[PDB]
Amino acid sequence: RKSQEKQLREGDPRKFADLAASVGNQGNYAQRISAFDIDYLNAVPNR
Amino acid sequence: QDAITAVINSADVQGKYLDTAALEKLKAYFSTGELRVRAATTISANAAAIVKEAVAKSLLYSDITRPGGNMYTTRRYAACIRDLDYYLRYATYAMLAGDPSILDERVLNGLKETYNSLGVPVGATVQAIQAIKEVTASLVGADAGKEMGIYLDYISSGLS
Amino acid sequence: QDAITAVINSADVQGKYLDTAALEKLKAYFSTGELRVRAATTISANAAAIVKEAVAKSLLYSDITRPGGNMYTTRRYAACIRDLDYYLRYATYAMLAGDPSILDERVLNGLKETYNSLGVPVGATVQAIQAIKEVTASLVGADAGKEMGIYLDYISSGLS
Amino acid sequence: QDAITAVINSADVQGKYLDTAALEKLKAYFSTGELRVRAATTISANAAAIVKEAVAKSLLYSDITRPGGNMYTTRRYAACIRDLDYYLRYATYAMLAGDPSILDERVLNGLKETYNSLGVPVGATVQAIQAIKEVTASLVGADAGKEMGIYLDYISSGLS
Amino acid sequence: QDAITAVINSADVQGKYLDTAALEKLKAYFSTGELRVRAATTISANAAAIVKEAVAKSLLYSDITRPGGNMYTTRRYAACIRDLDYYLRYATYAMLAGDPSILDERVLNGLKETYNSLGVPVGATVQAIQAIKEVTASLVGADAGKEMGIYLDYISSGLS
Amino acid sequence: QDAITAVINSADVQGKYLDTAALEKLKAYFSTGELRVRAATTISANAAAIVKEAVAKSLLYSDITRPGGNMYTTRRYAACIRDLDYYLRYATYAMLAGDPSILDERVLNGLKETYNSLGVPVGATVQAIQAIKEVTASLVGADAGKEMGIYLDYISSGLS
Amino acid sequence: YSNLYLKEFYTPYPNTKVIELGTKHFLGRAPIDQAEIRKYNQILATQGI
Amino acid sequence: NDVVIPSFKPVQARIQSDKTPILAKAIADLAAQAKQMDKSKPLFIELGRS
Amino acid sequence: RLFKITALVPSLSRTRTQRELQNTYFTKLVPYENWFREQQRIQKAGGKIIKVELATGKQGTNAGL
Amino acid sequence: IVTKSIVNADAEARYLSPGELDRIKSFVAGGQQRLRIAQALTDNRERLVKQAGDQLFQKRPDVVSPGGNAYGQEMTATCLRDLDYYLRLVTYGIVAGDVTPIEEIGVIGVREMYKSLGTPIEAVGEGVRALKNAASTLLSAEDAAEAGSYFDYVVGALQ
Amino acid sequence: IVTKSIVNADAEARYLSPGELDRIKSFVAGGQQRLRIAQALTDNRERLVKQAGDQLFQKRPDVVSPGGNAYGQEMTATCLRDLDYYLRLVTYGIVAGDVTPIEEIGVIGVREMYKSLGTPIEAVGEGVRALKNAASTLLSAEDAAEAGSYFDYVVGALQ
Amino acid sequence: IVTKSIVNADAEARYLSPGELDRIKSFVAGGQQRLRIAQALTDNRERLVKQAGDQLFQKRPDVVSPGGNAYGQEMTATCLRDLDYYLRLVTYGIVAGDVTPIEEIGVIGVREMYKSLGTPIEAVGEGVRALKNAASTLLSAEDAAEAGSYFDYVVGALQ
Amino acid sequence: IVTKSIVNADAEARYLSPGELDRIKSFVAGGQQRLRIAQALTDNRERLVKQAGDQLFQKRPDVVSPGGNAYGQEMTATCLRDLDYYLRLVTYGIVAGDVTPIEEIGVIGVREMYKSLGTPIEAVGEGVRALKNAASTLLSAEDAAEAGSYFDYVVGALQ
Numbered sequence A: 001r002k003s004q005e006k007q008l009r010e011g012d013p014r015k016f017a018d019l020a021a022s023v024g025n026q027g028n029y030a031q032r033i034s035a036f037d038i039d040y041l042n043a044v045p046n047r
Numbered sequence B, C, D, E, F: 001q002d003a004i005t006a007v008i009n010s011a012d013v014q015g016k017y018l019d020t021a022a023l024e025k026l027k028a029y030f031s032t033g034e035l036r037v038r039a040a041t042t043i044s045a046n047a048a049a050i051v052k053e054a055v056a057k058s059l060l061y062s063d064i065t066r067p068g069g070n071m072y073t074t075r076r077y078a079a080c081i082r083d084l085d086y087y088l089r090y091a092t093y094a095m096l097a098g099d100p101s102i103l104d105e106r107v108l109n110g111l112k113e114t115y116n117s118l119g120v121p122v123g124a125t126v127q128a129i130q131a132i133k134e135v136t137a138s139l140v141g142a143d144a145g146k147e148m149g150i151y152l153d154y155i156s157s158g159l160s
Numbered sequence G: 001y002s003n004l005y006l007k008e009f010y011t012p013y014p015n016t017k018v019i020e021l022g023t024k025h026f027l028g029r030a031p032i033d034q035a036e037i038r039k040y041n042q043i044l045a046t047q048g049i
Numbered sequence H: 001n002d003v004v005i006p007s008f009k010p011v012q013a014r015i016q017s018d019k020t021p022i023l024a025k026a027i028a029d030l031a032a033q034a035k036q037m038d039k040s041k042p043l044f045i046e047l048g049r050s
Numbered sequence I: 001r002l003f004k005i006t007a008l009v010p011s012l013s014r015t016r017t018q019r020e021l022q023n024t025y026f027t028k029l030v031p032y033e034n035w036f037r038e039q040q041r042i043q044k045a046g047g048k049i050i051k052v053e054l055a056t057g058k059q060g061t062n063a064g065l
Numbered sequence J, K, L, M: 001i002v003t004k005s006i007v008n009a010d011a012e013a014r015y016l017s018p019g020e021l022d023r024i025k026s027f028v029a030g031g032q033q034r035l036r037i038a039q040a041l042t043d044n045r046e047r048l049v050k051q052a053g054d055q056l057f058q059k060r061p062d063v064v065s066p067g068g069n070a071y072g073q074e075m076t077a078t079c080l081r082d083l084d085y086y087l088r089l090v091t092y093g094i095v096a097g098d099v100t101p102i103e104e105i106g107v108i109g110v111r112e113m114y115k116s117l118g119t120p121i122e123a124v125g126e127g128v129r130a131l132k133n134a135a136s137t138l139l140s141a142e143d144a145a146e147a148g149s150y151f152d153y154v155v156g157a158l159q
């Protein structure tokens, strides 16, 4: 309790934390394509 | 050299004072310097994106990056990116000077000697400079893209 | 040195007599000496309470008084109280003189050498002097707290 | 110098041949060289991860990376990463040599002079080298982490 | 550094935005820049005349230019003119920057070491810089001569 | 006084009008005023139960309610109930104003001297006010509970 | 380039001192200010001598 | 063996901005420029400014 | 990997009174990663680069230089 | 309206009424429109004050007559500053919802003041009426009813 | 820009050439517009960081994705703090008129810092591009051009 | 002045710093005044060479004297042709804005040329000073300042 | 007088005792009379040096006599310059309230200086006595008492 009561110093990471929550945007989900079925030797295109 | 310095030199070697045609040339340069500076700023913005888009347009997924090609080894890929960054940067300098003499003095001097010594393919370089020119003419607009494409085509024509 | 002695010295090294600007400086000092003396009296009242409140604000219940910190040993806690009492006392002397030269001559002379020799943390000292300044500016009022905070911030700035 | 070269030197300055105690020292070195080489390989694996974890343990989210601290400017952050990579690399060299003389000759020679000239905090450097030592002793195991921590503590003790 | 760059740095190391006192400092600099530029122009006019008048005021017809003095040899007279031109030029730079840090960084760094190594008399140099200051304060006016004499007296005080 | 009249008084001492900073403060006050109204209703619901739970948690079955204490007598117990009822009511008023100065001017003017002269203990009142703060924070909610607790702690700090 | 010079000046001397001993030999004079020590220290950092 | 020049110790100046006394005269003259009547806009708005 | 270069330097700034013949024109070998900044430095003086030739190196080889 | 409700419930022994809490809720709901009206009146300070003062001198030429009080450039500048002060207090009252800022800054002792200054009260009142008419023409219609009714309080309280 | 010309003429033994004095006089003339642009970017900082985080996390969702660096509230707060730092350095470069006091604090060693932090530099460049777009919407045309100047320098520097 | 900034930023691996872009934009703005000054010095050349020969041969009569170099009509015609050359190079430097295309043609090897021609260089410096005085009489104040700039460079160069 | 009490309480480990604070408050009160006395002695300096040289050379004619030191115009000008110096130090001691900043510059090594200059010290004491008499004629009674204080200190010091 005595670590939270001093004061967050200027230029902290917490001040911009609230802004991050406001923007939201959870990142994208996994593609699900499996590296065993990619067939990478045939899948690469020339040019 | 400049366009200003070229006009001053052409007036100097005759012993001529600055007549009205030279003043017309300098005033045309002072008119075009606005878009020259704005074009140089936005080309200095995203030069790496221009080089990336140019190799993705022209050189990637060919046989050149396959084994046997000249861009197979990763030091050769880095040298390719370096050469394209050189072409774009010196074309920016020649665009802001308004005179292609720095291309003749600093880039196009002994370059075919080097590219025939190392076995560098010349036609793929010309097509890469062409893709550079298309990308920066799209990025900067048509009106400054003309002057950018003039010096990039100067590099392409002197290379061939 | 004083503010009086500094004015006399600045008039002396030119060989100048006391002109009207120096008389303005001395008369401003003779105007401000009232609150200077009253502030020095009430700071001399409760210096121990100021140091106690300052360590309770800044240094206590941190890792500094925990083992591993620089104020863990009880002789080091007593040395901390001694250093803070020194800062407050010499700031009182510099406030009543109206000239920070005694801080430069008696406190700030070889102090960073000592604090880097002993491994004393400098930022915690600066914070403690800041808490001293806030406590005495609350205790004495704003009008003399400005002049007290000037010399305490002088000690803090020379320490850093 | 080596442990081999130190044994040969200590036998040489007496004019002594290789007696059985020196052969014991060399055979102990030839026994320990297995884990010496394996430890050096896995430390050369992920040195950047070790330095990243060490600054995340010790130096990050402090006042040192805040403005006013010595790691605020981004060139100073890059110099901090460079110094920690130096400490880890030369500790790897001293671990594989089995003799701390290269630390005395190449790192610890004029380093306190430099760190007191630039105003670099010494205690934060010692704690960063300590966090380096804990991370690599976790990463390599206890049996080679002892010998890694010996030379890292040698750097820490000579720095102080 | 500048006065602008010093204000920006002092606001930066706190993490502070540009408060009204810093804006007052920058607006005072933007007020004084007029006479700063005009003074720098007329000092760049006749620097050789200023150095000539200064050596004719202070150093000439003394024992210093007599044999046995430090300005007897003609290469030493040329080195004297070079040093005085350096003092005037760097004082012009510090006057136009409005911050004496370039004097501390480029002139006053290792200068007493050099002048005590070569046996250069320091007091005659101080009197020559004083004569420089009087000549340029007469030449530029009192209002810019104050700011010129501040940095010339800074060089004189750091030299002693 | 309100938060609105505080904003108006601050702008009136400045001598300017209500532009965007004061307008944004007023928009903030309006947005919290909705939940402030809802909290005023839910506090005026069961003020008697709040005082009853507070005295049952804190003051009952102690030495002050026993014979030989300040709350022994029936008129003294009724005065205690009405004082806690006041502290709740004026903390409700200071919550709805968004401003503690009306609360200070109303009760903290003379309650210090009154509790001094009557021999009323201060710390038991501070404990009772803290019990009111816990009961109202449990009853109303989180953010309106801490809004109530700000002014209740203001009362408890003014009595101490 | 030769390993001789590597054994005379790089091996008994640190990375800080080799900058001055390397600009004394080639350029004929000490390094000028701190930034000229910083660039050469980065070159001795991620590249060889 | 000891290093001849380890680094360059940064030295602080003994004048920051309080001197340079018409940068300093400008601080004052311009701070007092704000509160002298500023006649550019109508006069009635310029008697009501504290 | 070395190059054989023949090049010329202008020396425009000062009127040299010494021999200074080697510098204006030379035929020298330069290593691989060195010819880069040599190229750049020769172009800084406006120097003509006459002929670049391979001395050492087979082009198109990847390992072993 | 919060201060007045609190002191009215302070005179009694009881809390704030449900009716009064509805008043505070409706005042909060209309507060954003009141800030818009304050925005328009802040940004139209110059021309509103000048048009109202010149309408006053159009109606009442006695003040700018040489026997009058507002004779001369400085006196008429102070006249326009008085109208500026009253428009500022009207904006404060539009924002607060009370008339206690208008009252205790500019209403409560103004008769004795303008008696000792030699200034007629009715011409002040006619100038504030001109301000009411001008700000009524600038704003939206029932928004102008809102602004002009606070102006109406100032006009009726000056006389 | 004065330190630039001073060290530029200081490497030479010559004085400051009067064309450099002309450029200093012109910068001294334009300093008032520079100060207004810097104050306009100053007071509206949290809007710019909000819209920059908006446009960035709409553009690149991998920092939002748990494999990326800016995953969670603490890491996304550090991300918006980095964008706040870069906006602050852009205001410094707007006042100073030349990109030295912003490159000295934000550019000169940024690639190895972000490499040993794990974050990609292209996402930071896209964040400064979003800051440039939001400040272009916030300012007028001649102000957005002169702000997009230094924003453009940062975007070119981070790549 | 564009070649100066270009080779200045070209020795470095950095781009053109935008303070240099500001000085190029300011030179682009002042180019019209530069062109008018150059045309005014252009059309009035023979007056300037006449008054320069006037003031020089009044100042130094040894070139007129038969031991000096400019003795006779042919040598004095070559002398005024040299002054014509220097006026032409001054107009080139006025247009270019920086003294590179005039030093490249008239300054960089002039001392050994005039030494192996027998002429003194101080008389040439006095001739360019006379050209500066005559052009100062020919132009307005802000034009004579900016012409005496490059004339001053030539006078300092010939010494 | 503040440095006196400060080093006085500083040799001890105690604070400034409040009787010393009373004497500092009283000196702070009398500082205005001190400043008026110092300005009155300031503006009338050349009268005081004239009358001091008058009364001294009437009193002791050996400095006028060629065996004495102050023989000739140069030596008598140096003599009146010494009297000017001592009047200046007396004004310093009048402002400072205690004789430390005047003894530090004029008293502490004066006997060996005047001994190795050849001048007698008693004539200097008579000169400061003449300065005291002229300033006693120049000032009022309570001002001449407080000036003759420090003049008396100098006269006692030179003997």
Ligand SMILES: CCC1=C(C)/C(=C/C2=NC(=C\c3[nH]c(/C=C4\NC(=O)[C@H](C)[C@H]4CC)c(C)c3CCC(=O)O)/C(CCC(=O)O)=C2C)NC1=O
Residues within 6 Å of the ligand: B064, B070, B071, B075, B076, B077, B079, B080, B081, B083, B084, B086, B087, B090, B106, B107, B108, B111, B114, B118, B120, B121, B122, B124, B125, B128, I032, I033, I035, I036, I039, I040
């Ligand atoms: C400023 C003007 C300028 C240029 C252009 C220049 C080019 C240049 N390109 C080189 C190599 C190279 N250049 C290329 C470039 C290419 N090969 C391809 O397949 C593509 C068609 C093309 C890229 C678009 C490659 C792949 C190498 C690597 C050869 C090697 O090093 O093994 C080399 C050999 C040494 C080195 O890179 O560091 C030079 C000097 N030097 C200059 O001073």
Ligand SMILES: CCC1=C(C)/C(=C/C2=NC(=C\c3[nH]c(/C=C4\NC(=O)[C@H](C)[C@H]4CC)c(C)c3CCC(=O)O)/C(CCC(=O)O)=C2C)NC1=O
Residues within 6 Å of the ligand: C064, C070, C071, C075, C076, C077, C079, C080, C081, C083, C084, C086, C087, C090, C106, C107, C108, C111, C114, C118, C120, C121, C122, C124, C125, C128
């Ligand atoms: C008048 C000016 C003046 C000062 C300040 C001064 C300081 C001073 N502080 C010392 C120690 C110390 N100073 C501190 C102070 C601190 N360490 C912390 O963690 C805090 C940040 C800070 C207290 C606020 C401590 C803890 C020691 C004990 C070190 C030791 O003795 O083992 C010592 C070593 C010997 C001794 O105390 O008796 C000196 C000389 N001397 C002076 O003449």
Ligand SMILES: CCC1=C(C)/C(=C/C2=NC(=C\c3[nH]c(/C=C4\NC(=O)[C@H](C)[C@H]4CC)c(C)c3CCC(=O)O)/C(CCC(=O)O)=C2C)NC1=O
Residues within 6 Å of the ligand: F064, F070, F071, F075, F076, F077, F079, F080, F081, F083, F084, F086, F106, F107, F111, F114, F118, F120, F121, F122, F124, F125, F128
């Ligand atoms: C509306 C603002 C306001 C307040 C708060 C107020 C308080 C107040 N409390 C009083 C007494 C009292 N106050 C207390 C209070 C307490 N005893 C304790 O042990 C506890 C610490 C505390 C109860 C929580 C007691 C016991 C008395 C009567 C003491 C006596 O018999 O004289 C009196 C003297 C007259 C009386 O009421 O009997 C006043 C005026 N007056 C005001 O105008």
Ligand SMILES: CCC1=C(C)/C(=C/C2=NC(=C\c3[nH]c(/C=C4\NC(=O)[C@H](C)[C@H]4CC)c(C)c3CCC(=O)O)/C(CCC(=O)O)=C2C)NC1=O
Residues within 6 Å of the ligand: D064, D070, D071, D075, D076, D077, D079, D080, D081, D083, D084, D086, D087, D090, D106, D107, D108, D111, D114, D118, D120, D121, D122, D124, D125, D128, G014, G015, G016, G037, G038, G039, G041, G042, H007
């Ligand atoms: C092989 C042995 C060896 C070391 C260690 C070495 C260090 C060294 N560290 C330096 C700077 C620095 N060193 C640090 C390091 C630190 N500051 C802190 O706050 C932390 C406690 C610590 C990092 C853990 C920093 C921040 C600078 C930047 C100072 C500056 O350049 O402005 C410099 C100045 C020039 C430069 O970096 O390029 C040297 C020479 N040189 C060597 O040859």
Ligand SMILES: CCC1=C(C)/C(=C/C2=NC(=C\c3[nH]c(/C=C4\NC(=O)[C@H](C)[C@H]4CC)c(C)c3CCC(=O)O)/C(CCC(=O)O)=C2C)NC1=O
Residues within 6 Å of the ligand: H047, J063, J069, J070, J071, J075, J076, J078, J079, J080, J082, J083, J085, J086, J105, J106, J117, J119, J120, J121, J122, J123, J124, J125, J127
């Ligand atoms: C915020 C509340 C407030 C008000 C209302 C106010 C009025 C006010 N009006 C004044 C003068 C004046 N006021 C007027 C007013 C008028 N001319 C007329 O005939 C009209 C009826 C009226 C215009 C509405 C005139 C002519 C003077 C100058 C009188 C003098 O200088 O003696 C003065 C004295 C000079 C000054 O300090 O400006 C005050 C204080 N001050 C306040 O703080």
Ligand SMILES: CCC1=C(C)/C(=C/C2=NC(=C\c3[nH]c(/C=C4\NC(=O)[C@H](C)[C@H]4CC)c(C)c3CCC(=O)O)/C(CCC(=O)O)=C2C)NC1=O
Residues within 6 Å of the ligand: A013, D060, D061, D065, D066, D072, D073, D074, D077, K056, K063, K068, K069, K070, K071, K075, K076, K078, K079, K080, K082, K083, K085, K086, K089, K105, K106, K110, K117, K118, K119, K120, K121, K123, K124, K127
């Ligand atoms: C003013 C000069 C300056 C810079 C440039 C700077 C960068 C900086 N970025 C950091 C972290 C960070 N920086 C980012 C960055 C990003 N989020 C992303 O996905 C993007 C790639 C990018 C921003 C949109 C993240 C995610 C962290 C936290 C990483 C970690 O905790 O390991 C940290 C370590 C934590 C801290 O102490 O703040 C520093 C020092 N600090 C400075 O003082």
Ligand SMILES: CCC1=C(C)/C(=C/C2=NC(=C\c3[nH]c(/C=C4\NC(=O)[C@H](C)[C@H]4CC)c(C)c3CCC(=O)O)/C(CCC(=O)O)=C2C)NC1=O
Residues within 6 Å of the ligand: L056, L063, L068, L069, L070, L071, L075, L076, L078, L079, L080, L082, L083, L085, L086, L089, L105, L106, L110, L117, L118, L119, L120, L121, L123, L124, L127
């Ligand atoms: C544009 C660059 C440029 C310069 C500077 C230049 C100088 C120049 N001056 C020359 C002669 C001369 N120059 C002068 C000069 C002077 N009369 C005096 O007394 C004064 C010292 C001075 C001028 C006022 C004289 C007298 C001669 C003829 C000398 C002779 O015939 O030997 C000649 C040889 C004759 C010729 O071919 O014109 C050259 C080349 N030529 C150039 O193309």
Ligand SMILES: CCC1=C(C)/C(=C/C2=NC(=C\c3[nH]c(/C=C4\NC(=O)[C@H](C)[C@H]4CC)c(C)c3CCC(=O)O)/C(CCC(=O)O)=C2C)NC1=O
Residues within 6 Å of the ligand: M056, M063, M068, M069, M070, M071, M075, M076, M078, M079, M080, M082, M083, M085, M086, M089, M105, M106, M110, M117, M118, M119, M120, M121, M123, M124, M127
């Ligand atoms: C402010 C402190 C201070 C003192 C006290 C002072 C004394 C002083 N008196 C001097 C000379 C002198 N002083 C006197 C003095 C006198 N004429 C007489 O007959 C009387 C005995 C006496 C004055 C009435 C004379 C005659 C000389 C010239 C002696 C000589 O040239 O050898 C000189 C040497 C010449 C000079 O540089 O002025 C000094 C330094 N200088 C100082 O800076």
